[PDB]
Amino acid sequence: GATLKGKLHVPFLLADGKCTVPLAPEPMITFGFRSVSLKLHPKNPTYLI
């Protein structure tokens, strides 16, 4: 028969907040005519965009 007897809430949902994220050690930049050569030393796999 019909069995739906009620609803009950689900806790611990995703909520917005602030999370600490690391900074990779600053690039070493060298300049040239219409050229920028930056040396990078990741501590973790890091994106360059």
Binding site: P25, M28, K39, H41
Partner: protein, 50 residues
């Protein structure tokens, strides 16, 4: 430099080739030698040897 035994003198003259496997500047680590052009003292850069 000579050497003298029992009357005979032996003299090892200069080698016909002055080749050496080690370059001008090398690195020793863990009992092994490396041909590495390391920076001179005070000029080492971050993220590299020295």
């Amino acid at each position: 430099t000579p050497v003298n035994f029992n009357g005979v003198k032996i003299t090892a003259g200069p080698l016909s080739t002055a080749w050496t496997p080690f370059d001008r500047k090398i690195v020793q680590y863990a009992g092994e030698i490396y041909n590495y052009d390391f920076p001179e003292y005070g000029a080492g850069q971050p993220g590299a040897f020295g």
